[PDB]
Amino acid sequence: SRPKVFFDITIGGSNAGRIVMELFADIVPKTAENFRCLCTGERGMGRSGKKLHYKGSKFHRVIPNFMLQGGDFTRGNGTGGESIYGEKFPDENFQEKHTGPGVLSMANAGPNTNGSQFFICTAKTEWLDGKHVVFGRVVEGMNVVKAVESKGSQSGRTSADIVISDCGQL
Ligand SMILES: [Cl-]
């Protein structure tokens, strides 16, 4: 009874595969619900007047041996995004930790500023523990994550556009 959601990814417009994620609704239900709803689009419109939906959004930064950073569906550059609760929402808890590749964690701009931006880790990032809320994990498609990672760079700039071409709940 953890929900599962997915991204179908394109690289330069072409399918790269599917990433399937399990969400820790048992541990961080409010955070999991935000992410689940951003996958389905079911809540409609955000504060921005744009759809609360990851579909069509790009990864703004992809950093080899660190993580993929995405979820800015209003600007695609790491300065936008919003949650189903409004512009920001509180840090629910820090129970789950950044233990390795496949960890799903919320990006933020300090305490209690969760929106829609998220991280998919490609390494163990323990220094983020207690600062970023971990709310799930990749359960299928780490090879897709690796393919995306290879289009990244140290600055995070991608050599081809990395887009969530479709998403939803399974
Ligand atoms: Cl905590």
mmCIF file with all atom_site columns, all heavy atoms in Angstrom, residues 101-124:
data_model
loop_
_atom_site.group_PDB
_atom_site.id
_atom_site.type_symbol
_atom_site.label_atom_id
_atom_site.label_alt_id
_atom_site.label_comp_id
_atom_site.label_asym_id
_atom_site.label_entity_id
_atom_site.label_seq_id
_atom_site.pdbx_PDB_ins_code
_atom_site.Cartn_x
_atom_site.Cartn_y
_atom_site.Cartn_z
_atom_site.occupancy
_atom_site.B_iso_or_equiv
_atom_site.pdbx_formal_charge
_atom_site.auth_seq_id
_atom_site.auth_comp_id
_atom_site.auth_asym_id
_atom_site.auth_atom_id
_atom_site.pdbx_PDB_model_num
ATOM 1   N N   . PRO A 1 101 ? 21.926 5.565  -4.329  1.00 0.00 ? 101 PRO A N   1
ATOM 2   C CA  . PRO A 1 101 ? 21.220 5.819  -5.573  1.00 0.00 ? 101 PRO A CA  1
ATOM 3   C C   . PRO A 1 101 ? 19.753 5.428  -5.490  1.00 0.00 ? 101 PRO A C   1
ATOM 4   O O   . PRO A 1 101 ? 19.412 4.420  -4.849  1.00 0.00 ? 101 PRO A O   1
ATOM 5   C CB  . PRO A 1 101 ? 21.929 4.916  -6.584  1.00 0.00 ? 101 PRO A CB  1
ATOM 6   C CG  . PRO A 1 101 ? 23.262 4.644  -5.994  1.00 0.00 ? 101 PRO A CG  1
ATOM 7   C CD  . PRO A 1 101 ? 23.057 4.640  -4.517  1.00 0.00 ? 101 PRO A CD  1
ATOM 8   N N   . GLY A 1 102 ? 18.904 6.223  -6.137  1.00 0.00 ? 102 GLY A N   1
ATOM 9   C CA  . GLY A 1 102 ? 17.473 5.935  -6.227  1.00 0.00 ? 102 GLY A CA  1
ATOM 10  C C   . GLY A 1 102 ? 16.621 6.636  -5.183  1.00 0.00 ? 102 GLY A C   1
ATOM 11  O O   . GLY A 1 102 ? 15.391 6.577  -5.240  1.00 0.00 ? 102 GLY A O   1
ATOM 12  N N   . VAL A 1 103 ? 17.266 7.292  -4.219  1.00 0.00 ? 103 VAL A N   1
ATOM 13  C CA  . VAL A 1 103 ? 16.543 8.048  -3.188  1.00 0.00 ? 103 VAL A CA  1
ATOM 14  C C   . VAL A 1 103 ? 15.817 9.231  -3.825  1.00 0.00 ? 103 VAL A C   1
ATOM 15  O O   . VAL A 1 103 ? 16.406 9.932  -4.644  1.00 0.00 ? 103 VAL A O   1
ATOM 16  C CB  . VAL A 1 103 ? 17.523 8.548  -2.097  1.00 0.00 ? 103 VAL A CB  1
ATOM 17  C CG1 . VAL A 1 103 ? 16.881 9.611  -1.215  1.00 0.00 ? 103 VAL A CG1 1
ATOM 18  C CG2 . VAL A 1 103 ? 18.006 7.358  -1.268  1.00 0.00 ? 103 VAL A CG2 1
ATOM 19  N N   . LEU A 1 104 ? 14.532 9.401  -3.474  1.00 0.00 ? 104 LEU A N   1
ATOM 20  C CA  . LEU A 1 104 ? 13.724 10.546 -3.907  1.00 0.00 ? 104 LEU A CA  1
ATOM 21  C C   . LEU A 1 104 ? 13.567 11.508 -2.755  1.00 0.00 ? 104 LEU A C   1
ATOM 22  O O   . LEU A 1 104 ? 13.085 11.139 -1.676  1.00 0.00 ? 104 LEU A O   1
ATOM 23  C CB  . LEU A 1 104 ? 12.322 10.142 -4.327  1.00 0.00 ? 104 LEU A CB  1
ATOM 24  C CG  . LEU A 1 104 ? 12.169 9.141  -5.441  1.00 0.00 ? 104 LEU A CG  1
ATOM 25  C CD1 . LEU A 1 104 ? 10.682 8.985  -5.678  1.00 0.00 ? 104 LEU A CD1 1
ATOM 26  C CD2 . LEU A 1 104 ? 12.883 9.608  -6.691  1.00 0.00 ? 104 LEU A CD2 1
ATOM 27  N N   . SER A 1 105 ? 13.974 12.748 -2.977  1.00 0.00 ? 105 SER A N   1
ATOM 28  C CA  . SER A 1 105 ? 14.031 13.744 -1.920  1.00 0.00 ? 105 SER A CA  1
ATOM 29  C C   . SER A 1 105 ? 13.544 15.091 -2.437  1.00 0.00 ? 105 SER A C   1
ATOM 30  O O   . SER A 1 105 ? 13.677 15.385 -3.630  1.00 0.00 ? 105 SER A O   1
ATOM 31  C CB  . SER A 1 105 ? 15.481 13.850 -1.469  1.00 0.00 ? 105 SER A CB  1
ATOM 32  O OG  . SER A 1 105 ? 15.615 14.725 -0.391  1.00 0.00 ? 105 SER A OG  1
ATOM 33  N N   . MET A 1 106 ? 12.991 15.911 -1.548  1.00 0.00 ? 106 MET A N   1
ATOM 34  C CA  . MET A 1 106 ? 12.506 17.228 -1.948  1.00 0.00 ? 106 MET A CA  1
ATOM 35  C C   . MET A 1 106 ? 13.610 18.266 -1.968  1.00 0.00 ? 106 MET A C   1
ATOM 36  O O   . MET A 1 106 ? 14.355 18.400 -1.001  1.00 0.00 ? 106 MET A O   1
ATOM 37  C CB  . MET A 1 106 ? 11.415 17.725 -0.997  1.00 0.00 ? 106 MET A CB  1
ATOM 38  C CG  . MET A 1 106 ? 10.121 16.917 -1.053  1.00 0.00 ? 106 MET A CG  1
ATOM 39  S SD  . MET A 1 106 ? 9.340  16.898 -2.660  1.00 0.00 ? 106 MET A SD  1
ATOM 40  C CE  . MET A 1 106 ? 8.680  18.558 -2.740  1.00 0.00 ? 106 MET A CE  1
ATOM 41  N N   . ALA A 1 107 ? 13.668 19.034 -3.053  1.00 0.00 ? 107 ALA A N   1
ATOM 42  C CA  . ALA A 1 107 ? 14.501 20.226 -3.110  1.00 0.00 ? 107 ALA A CA  1
ATOM 43  C C   . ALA A 1 107 ? 13.840 21.293 -2.257  1.00 0.00 ? 107 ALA A C   1
ATOM 44  O O   . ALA A 1 107 ? 12.650 21.205 -1.969  1.00 0.00 ? 107 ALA A O   1
ATOM 45  C CB  . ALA A 1 107 ? 14.639 20.701 -4.543  1.00 0.00 ? 107 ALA A CB  1
ATOM 46  N N   . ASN A 1 108 ? 14.593 22.285 -1.818  1.00 0.00 ? 108 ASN A N   1
ATOM 47  C CA  . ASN A 1 108 ? 13.995 23.377 -1.046  1.00 0.00 ? 108 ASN A CA  1
ATOM 48  C C   . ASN A 1 108 ? 14.895 24.609 -1.031  1.00 0.00 ? 108 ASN A C   1
ATOM 49  O O   . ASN A 1 108 ? 15.981 24.591 -1.615  1.00 0.00 ? 108 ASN A O   1
ATOM 50  C CB  . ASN A 1 108 ? 13.640 22.889 0.381   1.00 0.00 ? 108 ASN A CB  1
ATOM 51  C CG  . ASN A 1 108 ? 14.863 22.514 1.206   1.00 0.00 ? 108 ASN A CG  1
ATOM 52  O OD1 . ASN A 1 108 ? 15.820 23.268 1.269   1.00 0.00 ? 108 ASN A OD1 1
ATOM 53  N ND2 . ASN A 1 108 ? 14.824 21.351 1.865   1.00 0.00 ? 108 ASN A ND2 1
ATOM 54  N N   . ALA A 1 109 ? 14.428 25.675 -0.385  1.00 0.00 ? 109 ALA A N   1
ATOM 55  C CA  . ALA A 1 109 ? 15.221 26.891 -0.168  1.00 0.00 ? 109 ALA A CA  1
ATOM 56  C C   . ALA A 1 109 ? 15.186 27.202 1.321   1.00 0.00 ? 109 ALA A C   1
ATOM 57  O O   . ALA A 1 109 ? 14.808 28.304 1.755   1.00 0.00 ? 109 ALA A O   1
ATOM 58  C CB  . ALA A 1 109 ? 14.690 28.047 -0.998  1.00 0.00 ? 109 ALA A CB  1
ATOM 59  N N   . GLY A 1 110 ? 15.606 26.200 2.090   1.00 0.00 ? 110 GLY A N   1
ATOM 60  C CA  . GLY A 1 110 ? 15.651 26.273 3.538   1.00 0.00 ? 110 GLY A CA  1
ATOM 61  C C   . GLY A 1 110 ? 14.478 25.589 4.188   1.00 0.00 ? 110 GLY A C   1
ATOM 62  O O   . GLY A 1 110 ? 13.667 24.962 3.508   1.00 0.00 ? 110 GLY A O   1
ATOM 63  N N   . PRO A 1 111 ? 14.377 25.705 5.525   1.00 0.00 ? 111 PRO A N   1
ATOM 64  C CA  . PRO A 1 111 ? 13.331 25.001 6.265   1.00 0.00 ? 111 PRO A CA  1
ATOM 65  C C   . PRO A 1 111 ? 11.911 25.343 5.810   1.00 0.00 ? 111 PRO A C   1
ATOM 66  O O   . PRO A 1 111 ? 11.598 26.500 5.571   1.00 0.00 ? 111 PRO A O   1
ATOM 67  C CB  . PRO A 1 111 ? 13.575 25.437 7.713   1.00 0.00 ? 111 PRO A CB  1
ATOM 68  C CG  . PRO A 1 111 ? 15.025 25.749 7.768   1.00 0.00 ? 111 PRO A CG  1
ATOM 69  C CD  . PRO A 1 111 ? 15.335 26.366 6.429   1.00 0.00 ? 111 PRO A CD  1
ATOM 70  N N   . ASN A 1 112 ? 11.076 24.314 5.683   1.00 0.00 ? 112 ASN A N   1
ATOM 71  C CA  . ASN A 1 112 ? 9.658  24.451 5.361   1.00 0.00 ? 112 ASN A CA  1
ATOM 72  C C   . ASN A 1 112 ? 9.373  25.228 4.075   1.00 0.00 ? 112 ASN A C   1
ATOM 73  O O   . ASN A 1 112 ? 8.502  26.091 4.047   1.00 0.00 ? 112 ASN A O   1
ATOM 74  C CB  . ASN A 1 112 ? 8.918  25.078 6.553   1.00 0.00 ? 112 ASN A CB  1
ATOM 75  C CG  . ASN A 1 112 ? 9.176  24.323 7.840   1.00 0.00 ? 112 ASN A CG  1
ATOM 76  O OD1 . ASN A 1 112 ? 9.003  23.110 7.896   1.00 0.00 ? 112 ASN A OD1 1
ATOM 77  N ND2 . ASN A 1 112 ? 9.601  25.036 8.885   1.00 0.00 ? 112 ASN A ND2 1
ATOM 78  N N   . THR A 1 113 ? 10.105 24.898 3.010   1.00 0.00 ? 113 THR A N   1
ATOM 79  C CA  . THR A 1 113 ? 9.895  25.529 1.710   1.00 0.00 ? 113 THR A CA  1
ATOM 80  C C   . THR A 1 113 ? 9.771  24.499 0.588   1.00 0.00 ? 113 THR A C   1
ATOM 81  O O   . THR A 1 113 ? 10.153 24.757 -0.558  1.00 0.00 ? 113 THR A O   1
ATOM 82  C CB  . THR A 1 113 ? 11.043 26.503 1.384   1.00 0.00 ? 113 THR A CB  1
ATOM 83  O OG1 . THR A 1 113 ? 12.286 25.798 1.417   1.00 0.00 ? 113 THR A OG1 1
ATOM 84  C CG2 . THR A 1 113 ? 11.083 27.650 2.367   1.00 0.00 ? 113 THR A CG2 1
ATOM 85  N N   . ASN A 1 114 ? 9.187  23.342 0.894   1.00 0.00 ? 114 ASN A N   1
ATOM 86  C CA  . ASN A 1 114 ? 8.951  22.331 -0.137  1.00 0.00 ? 114 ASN A CA  1
ATOM 87  C C   . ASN A 1 114 ? 7.939  22.829 -1.148  1.00 0.00 ? 114 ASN A C   1
ATOM 88  O O   . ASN A 1 114 ? 6.966  23.497 -0.778  1.00 0.00 ? 114 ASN A O   1
ATOM 89  C CB  . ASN A 1 114 ? 8.448  21.049 0.501   1.00 0.00 ? 114 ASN A CB  1
ATOM 90  C CG  . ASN A 1 114 ? 9.440  20.486 1.473   1.00 0.00 ? 114 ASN A CG  1
ATOM 91  O OD1 . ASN A 1 114 ? 10.467 19.967 1.062   1.00 0.00 ? 114 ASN A OD1 1
ATOM 92  N ND2 . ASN A 1 114 ? 9.177  20.645 2.767   1.00 0.00 ? 114 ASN A ND2 1
ATOM 93  N N   . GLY A 1 115 ? 8.186  22.528 -2.419  1.00 0.00 ? 115 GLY A N   1
ATOM 94  C CA  . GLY A 1 115 ? 7.274  22.901 -3.499  1.00 0.00 ? 115 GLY A CA  1
ATOM 95  C C   . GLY A 1 115 ? 7.006  21.701 -4.381  1.00 0.00 ? 115 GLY A C   1
ATOM 96  O O   . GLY A 1 115 ? 6.368  20.746 -3.952  1.00 0.00 ? 115 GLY A O   1
ATOM 97  N N   . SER A 1 116 ? 7.495  21.754 -5.619  1.00 0.00 ? 116 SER A N   1
ATOM 98  C CA  . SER A 1 116 ? 7.412  20.630 -6.540  1.00 0.00 ? 116 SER A CA  1
ATOM 99  C C   . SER A 1 116 ? 8.757  20.088 -6.948  1.00 0.00 ? 116 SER A C   1
ATOM 100 O O   . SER A 1 116 ? 8.831  18.982 -7.477  1.00 0.00 ? 116 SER A O   1
ATOM 101 C CB  . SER A 1 116 ? 6.654  21.034 -7.793  1.00 0.00 ? 116 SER A CB  1
ATOM 102 O OG  . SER A 1 116 ? 7.282  22.110 -8.449  1.00 0.00 ? 116 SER A OG  1
ATOM 103 N N   . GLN A 1 117 ? 9.828  20.844 -6.725  1.00 0.00 ? 117 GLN A N   1
ATOM 104 C CA  . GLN A 1 117 ? 11.134 20.378 -7.164  1.00 0.00 ? 117 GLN A CA  1
ATOM 105 C C   . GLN A 1 117 ? 11.626 19.221 -6.302  1.00 0.00 ? 117 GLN A C   1
ATOM 106 O O   . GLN A 1 117 ? 11.447 19.205 -5.082  1.00 0.00 ? 117 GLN A O   1
ATOM 107 C CB  . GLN A 1 117 ? 12.158 21.504 -7.160  1.00 0.00 ? 117 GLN A CB  1
ATOM 108 C CG  . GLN A 1 117 ? 11.925 22.560 -8.229  1.00 0.00 ? 117 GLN A CG  1
ATOM 109 C CD  . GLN A 1 117 ? 12.975 23.649 -8.159  1.00 0.00 ? 117 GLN A CD  1
ATOM 110 O OE1 . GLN A 1 117 ? 14.170 23.371 -7.953  1.00 0.00 ? 117 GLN A OE1 1
ATOM 111 N NE2 . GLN A 1 117 ? 12.544 24.897 -8.289  1.00 0.00 ? 117 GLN A NE2 1
ATOM 112 N N   . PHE A 1 118 ? 12.263 18.261 -6.960  1.00 0.00 ? 118 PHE A N   1
ATOM 113 C CA  . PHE A 1 118 ? 12.707 17.042 -6.316  1.00 0.00 ? 118 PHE A CA  1
ATOM 114 C C   . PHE A 1 118 ? 14.053 16.602 -6.884  1.00 0.00 ? 118 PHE A C   1
ATOM 115 O O   . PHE A 1 118 ? 14.487 17.061 -7.957  1.00 0.00 ? 118 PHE A O   1
ATOM 116 C CB  . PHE A 1 118 ? 11.694 15.916 -6.543  1.00 0.00 ? 118 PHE A CB  1
ATOM 117 C CG  . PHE A 1 118 ? 11.525 15.568 -7.985  1.00 0.00 ? 118 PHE A CG  1
ATOM 118 C CD1 . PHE A 1 118 ? 12.318 14.591 -8.569  1.00 0.00 ? 118 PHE A CD1 1
ATOM 119 C CD2 . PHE A 1 118 ? 10.597 16.244 -8.773  1.00 0.00 ? 118 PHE A CD2 1
ATOM 120 C CE1 . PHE A 1 118 ? 12.185 14.276 -9.908  1.00 0.00 ? 118 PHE A CE1 1
ATOM 121 C CE2 . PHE A 1 118 ? 10.458 15.947 -10.114 1.00 0.00 ? 118 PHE A CE2 1
ATOM 122 C CZ  . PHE A 1 118 ? 11.253 14.955 -10.691 1.00 0.00 ? 118 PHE A CZ  1
ATOM 123 N N   . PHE A 1 119 ? 14.659 15.678 -6.148  1.00 0.00 ? 119 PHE A N   1
ATOM 124 C CA  . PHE A 1 119 ? 15.942 15.064 -6.456  1.00 0.00 ? 119 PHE A CA  1
ATOM 125 C C   . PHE A 1 119 ? 15.760 13.557 -6.648  1.00 0.00 ? 119 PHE A C   1
ATOM 126 O O   . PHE A 1 119 ? 15.035 12.922 -5.877  1.00 0.00 ? 119 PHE A O   1
ATOM 127 C CB  . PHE A 1 119 ? 16.924 15.189 -5.263  1.00 0.00 ? 119 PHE A CB  1
ATOM 128 C CG  . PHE A 1 119 ? 17.222 16.583 -4.777  1.00 0.00 ? 119 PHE A CG  1
ATOM 129 C CD1 . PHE A 1 119 ? 17.610 16.771 -3.454  1.00 0.00 ? 119 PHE A CD1 1
ATOM 130 C CD2 . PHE A 1 119 ? 17.245 17.689 -5.625  1.00 0.00 ? 119 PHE A CD2 1
ATOM 131 C CE1 . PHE A 1 119 ? 17.973 18.022 -2.986  1.00 0.00 ? 119 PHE A CE1 1
ATOM 132 C CE2 . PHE A 1 119 ? 17.588 18.952 -5.147  1.00 0.00 ? 119 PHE A CE2 1
ATOM 133 C CZ  . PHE A 1 119 ? 17.958 19.115 -3.833  1.00 0.00 ? 119 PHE A CZ  1
ATOM 134 N N   . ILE A 1 120 ? 16.417 12.982 -7.658  1.00 0.00 ? 120 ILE A N   1
ATOM 135 C CA  . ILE A 1 120 ? 16.639 11.535 -7.729  1.00 0.00 ? 120 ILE A CA  1
ATOM 136 C C   . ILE A 1 120 ? 18.141 11.336 -7.565  1.00 0.00 ? 120 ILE A C   1
ATOM 137 O O   . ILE A 1 120 ? 18.923 11.715 -8.439  1.00 0.00 ? 120 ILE A O   1
ATOM 138 C CB  . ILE A 1 120 ? 16.171 10.898 -9.053  1.00 0.00 ? 120 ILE A CB  1
ATOM 139 C CG1 . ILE A 1 120 ? 14.699 11.220 -9.325  1.00 0.00 ? 120 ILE A CG1 1
ATOM 140 C CG2 . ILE A 1 120 ? 16.414 9.390  -9.021  1.00 0.00 ? 120 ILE A CG2 1
ATOM 141 C CD1 . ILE A 1 120 ? 14.183 10.708 -10.657 1.00 0.00 ? 120 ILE A CD1 1
ATOM 142 N N   . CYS A 1 121 ? 18.548 10.788 -6.427  1.00 0.00 ? 121 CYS A N   1
ATOM 143 C CA  . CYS A 1 121 ? 19.977 10.623 -6.139  1.00 0.00 ? 121 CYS A CA  1
ATOM 144 C C   . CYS A 1 121 ? 20.600 9.533  -6.994  1.00 0.00 ? 121 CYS A C   1
ATOM 145 O O   . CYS A 1 121 ? 19.968 8.522  -7.311  1.00 0.00 ? 121 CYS A O   1
ATOM 146 C CB  . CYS A 1 121 ? 20.191 10.310 -4.667  1.00 0.00 ? 121 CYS A CB  1
ATOM 147 S SG  . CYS A 1 121 ? 19.600 11.598 -3.552  1.00 0.00 ? 121 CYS A SG  1
ATOM 148 N N   . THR A 1 122 ? 21.852 9.747  -7.388  1.00 0.00 ? 122 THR A N   1
ATOM 149 C CA  . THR A 1 122 ? 22.609 8.708  -8.073  1.00 0.00 ? 122 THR A CA  1
ATOM 150 C C   . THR A 1 122 ? 23.855 8.315  -7.261  1.00 0.00 ? 122 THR A C   1
ATOM 151 O O   . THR A 1 122 ? 24.749 7.632  -7.771  1.00 0.00 ? 122 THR A O   1
ATOM 152 C CB  . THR A 1 122 ? 22.993 9.136  -9.492  1.00 0.00 ? 122 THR A CB  1
ATOM 153 O OG1 . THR A 1 122 ? 23.792 10.319 -9.439  1.00 0.00 ? 122 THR A OG1 1
ATOM 154 C CG2 . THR A 1 122 ? 21.729 9.393  -10.344 1.00 0.00 ? 122 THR A CG2 1
ATOM 155 N N   . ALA A 1 123 ? 23.858 8.698  -5.987  1.00 0.00 ? 123 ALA A N   1
ATOM 156 C CA  . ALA A 1 123 ? 24.927 8.392  -5.043  1.00 0.00 ? 123 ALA A CA  1
ATOM 157 C C   . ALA A 1 123 ? 24.381 8.553  -3.626  1.00 0.00 ? 123 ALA A C   1
ATOM 158 O O   . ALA A 1 123 ? 23.259 9.048  -3.450  1.00 0.00 ? 123 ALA A O   1
ATOM 159 C CB  . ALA A 1 123 ? 26.094 9.338  -5.281  1.00 0.00 ? 123 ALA A CB  1
ATOM 160 N N   . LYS A 1 124 ? 25.162 8.151  -2.629  1.00 0.00 ? 124 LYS A N   1
ATOM 161 C CA  . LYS A 1 124 ? 24.799 8.368  -1.247  1.00 0.00 ? 124 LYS A CA  1
ATOM 162 C C   . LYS A 1 124 ? 25.121 9.808  -0.856  1.00 0.00 ? 124 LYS A C   1
ATOM 163 O O   . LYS A 1 124 ? 26.274 10.224 -0.894  1.00 0.00 ? 124 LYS A O   1
ATOM 164 C CB  . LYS A 1 124 ? 25.554 7.403  -0.339  1.00 0.00 ? 124 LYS A CB  1
ATOM 165 C CG  . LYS A 1 124 ? 25.116 7.513  1.110   1.00 0.00 ? 124 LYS A CG  1
ATOM 166 C CD  . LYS A 1 124 ? 25.831 6.508  1.984   1.00 0.00 ? 124 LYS A CD  1
ATOM 167 C CE  . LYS A 1 124 ? 25.479 6.776  3.431   1.00 0.00 ? 124 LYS A CE  1
ATOM 168 N NZ  . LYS A 1 124 ? 26.421 6.068  4.314   1.00 0.00 ? 124 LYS A NZ  1
#
